[PDB]
Amino acid sequence: GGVGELEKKAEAGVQGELAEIKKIAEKKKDDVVKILIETVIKPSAEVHINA
């Protein structure tokens, strides 16, 4: 009983963290996706330093 109650309490604590993770991901997904795409599309066209 105690182990099951402890597991349920831990899931309750994890539920808040998981909800916050989902909310912040949904909030900043557009921003991080924009940065990643901007980095991928433009490459640094430069020769090696030692060359």
Binding site: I35, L36, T39, V40, P43, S44, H48, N50, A51
Partner: protein
Amino acid sequence: VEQGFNVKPRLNYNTVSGVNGPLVILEKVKFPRYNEIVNLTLPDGTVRQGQVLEIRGDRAIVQVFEGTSGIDVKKTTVEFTGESLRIPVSEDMLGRIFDGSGRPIDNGPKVFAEDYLDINGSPINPYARIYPEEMISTGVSAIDTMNSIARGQKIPIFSASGLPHNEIAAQICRQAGLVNFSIVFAAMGVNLETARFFKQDFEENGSLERTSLFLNLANDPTIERIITPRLALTTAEYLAYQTERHVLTILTDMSSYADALREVSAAREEVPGRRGYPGYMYTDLSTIYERAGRVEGRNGSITQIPILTMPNDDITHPIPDLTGYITEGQIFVDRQLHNKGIYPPINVLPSLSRLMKSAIGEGMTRKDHGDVSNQLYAKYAIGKDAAAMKAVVGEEALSIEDKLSLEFLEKFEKTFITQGAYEDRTVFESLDQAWSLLRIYPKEMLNRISPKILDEFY
């Protein structure tokens, strides 16, 4: 960290000049970097990681992990990752079990990097180093009372081949604490049974919540065994200095690490040294150890328990000798004690903590710690001498201070040193047990204890 948002294409080399043992030799390499992590793609499709041991004109000697079996000159693609080995350090490393090369073998996701840190690190500025002050309490009563480990010192555990050094190290990992805290464990060349023992013990006893365990199996790559101390000490340096927590890094099987050093050194044309180990093993061990210590601006420490293994129980061996040289103490695990059945089989007489005076103080631990430790050592030596002399001059002819010393030796080996693997003896509880041992002596017999301490505690 804004420089992280960059894309660096990697050169895939199909040019393999030849294969010699563990090494893969390339050709037409554009600009190879020394100690560059490399992904070898076998013809069978298996991907293998490698590190370049040597560089030359458009030629790189890649030393692939997991051996060169199956490498084909014709169709082995070799991808150059233009960066030396790095670990994605984060505050979430605590609670993870990593492989020899940093890959998490735990049933969990990749560690979310907060930074990619170079595994080799940089030497700590001696001007920025601070003498250890307080004590890291260990559940091992013998260590925590007689060989107290200061916050920032490097005190190895010297054990033989079959002694329970791994069990003692696991106990230290499970029970260690401040008299935050985040232990870093590095298992090097351990048996697979030992590795699962470590993992299961930490997961079951909850010590994993503050440990970043680094498991390197005995059959894992030798270069990965070399890399593992670097990974563990880099994680410890992060945590302690960029997170302000006391670490207590616990390396294990520094003898296995030195064997890996030997194997890597002889991968090159380097001639063996004193007993096969390279001449720069002193430098390698010095780096691995002196990656610890307290620093000035940061409120965090790194402590080391290398848990070394003597090959033939010889202190004269190069690995124990050098480790002693760099380190600041020694804790001996004794075959005689182990055969008598005492756990932990720590032999106090040779063992000592060089920074005992710092850890055994008044604000830290208790005010009787140093005097009690000195008195216990003196009476233990007297007990050993009386045990030797009993079979020579009979039990009757021994003095009263020798019969009492034999009684103390029995009650010390069988009650104080003998500590259950899963019982936690705080430093104060172990001091109380030590006083209970010392109370069989008359108050006049305890010469090393100060009179004030005798009046207060006896």
